[PDB]
């Protein structure tokens, strides 16, 4: 069974180690999986777990629509769910 | 098949509202539940999710098997599972 979260047949596995966005994307591609989509998890209960975690859009997943746009975030490192 | 983490039957439900230890225990008991035990989660993946969350022993869960006890956890507030 899934070793993490589950929601309509999508099993989310956490990777505790901090890594950049491109590193997260490469590691996710290695395990034949993709990073979470913000729209897929915005209204659901998974958000509390996914907060401050990388998303496919290239920015951290934040519940509030407000975001600190125009700020370079590529240099940051955060946990990723896949 | 619950809205949380499943391990060996027991289901863990996250509460994102910061509460003290006594309040966390009261809420968990009101929901017919008890706070997680350190022994069951120390050696399992669940730790990565329940780190810095309250436990039954009255201290935040920490990966270290043996650590100095601050004993001032009375005034601290952290999220809880149950």
């Amino acid at each position: 069974s899934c070793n993490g979260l589950y929601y309509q047949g999508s099993c989310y596995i956490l990777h505790s180690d901090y890594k950049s966005f491109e590193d997260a994307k490469a590691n996710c591609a290695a395990e034949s999986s993709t990073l979470p989509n913000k729209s897929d998890v915005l209204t659901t209960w998974l958000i509390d777990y996914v907060e401050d975690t990388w998303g496919s859009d290239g920015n951290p997943i934040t519940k509030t629509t407000s975001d600190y746009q125009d700020s370079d975030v590529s240099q940051e490192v955060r946990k990723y769910f896949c | 098949s619950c809205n949380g983490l499943y391990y060996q039957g027991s289901c863990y439900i996250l509460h994102s509202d910061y509460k003290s230890f006594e309040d966390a225990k009261a809420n968990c008991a009101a929901e017919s539940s008890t706070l997680p035990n350190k022994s069951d989660v120390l050696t399992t993946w669940l730790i990565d999710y329940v780190e810095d969350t309250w436990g039954s022993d009255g201290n935040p869960i920490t990966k270290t098997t043996s650590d100095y006890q601050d004993s001032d956890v009375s005034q601290e507030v952290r999220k809880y599972f149950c």
Partner: antibody
Framework: QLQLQESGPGLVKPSETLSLTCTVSGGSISSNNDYWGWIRQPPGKGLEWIGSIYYSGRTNGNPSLKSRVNISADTSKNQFSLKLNSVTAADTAVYYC?????????????????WGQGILVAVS | EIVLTQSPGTLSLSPGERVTLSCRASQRVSSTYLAWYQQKPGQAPRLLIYGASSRATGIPDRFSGSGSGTDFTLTISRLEPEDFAVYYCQHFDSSLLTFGGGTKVEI
């Protein structure tokens, strides 16, 4: 109980390389939730962040010193070290080895709680 | 990039009053990143507030924090003799770390 202790010389010569090593007792440098960094305070002035390191090997440093900072980590001996080349008289300061906490997934702790005693380094 | 400026370099206060120390950011910075530290002479800094509102372990209830955006404040209701020290405001985001100039509490 996590204590950080610094060891190294205090007589670095101009145009040479410093060698400071910080060792941690009561914990393991292999901590997914924390970085380990060096912060220098010149005597009677404000703090300055001279670098950080992750157990994997990733290095982050302040751009003004990015050219001269080569931080290293050794997990087996549980020691993290700083090397500063092309030293100049303005670098004299008290150096602290600290733990830059990032926090767990649910608890976010963005601060450096544990600091070392600090080691004073000057120049000839 | 991000620079934190503490306008009041030094403050004069007698014991027992309430003191508010202000830290400003060049650009908007989220609350969770900000922190407030205290440093006595000849000792390493000790964490006072993290997240701008959370007291660290062992910090008395006198210290408290508030603010948002480009202005944050650390308020000490009662100034005991120990509270007289330098106070720093720090920005950390898992990347470049920045420290404030510092404000000294004397009489």
């Amino acid at each position: 109980q996590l204590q950080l202790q610094e060891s190294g010389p205090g007589l670095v010569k101009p145009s040479e390389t410093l060698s400071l090593t910080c060792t941690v007792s009561g914990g393991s440098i292999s901590s997914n939730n924390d970085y380990w960094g060096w912060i220098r305070q010149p005597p009677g002035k404000g703090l300055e962040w001279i670098g950080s390191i992750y157990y994997s090997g990733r290095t982050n440093g302040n751009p003004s010193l990015k050219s001269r900072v080569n931080i290293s980590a050794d997990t087996s001996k549980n020691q993290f070290s700083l090397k500063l080349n092309s030293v100049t008289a303005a670098d004299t300061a008290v150096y602290y080895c600290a733990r830059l906490r990032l926090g767990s997934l649910l608890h976010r702790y963005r601060a450096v709680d544990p600091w070392g005693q600090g080691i004073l380094v000057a120049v000839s | 990039e991000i620079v934190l400026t503490q306008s009041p370099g030094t403050l004069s206060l007698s014991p027992g009053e309430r003191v508010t120390l202000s830290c400003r950011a060049s650009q908007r910075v989220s609350s969770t990143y900000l922190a407030w530290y205290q440093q006595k002479p000849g000792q390493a800094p000790r964490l006072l507030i993290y997240g701008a509102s959370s007291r660290a372990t062992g910090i008395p209830d006198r210290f408290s924090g508030s603010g948002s955006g480009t202005d944050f404040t650390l308020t000490i209701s009662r100034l005991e003799p120990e509270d007289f020290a330098v106070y720093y405001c720090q920005h950390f985001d898992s990347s470049l770390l920045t420290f404030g100039g510092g404000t000294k509490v004397e009489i």
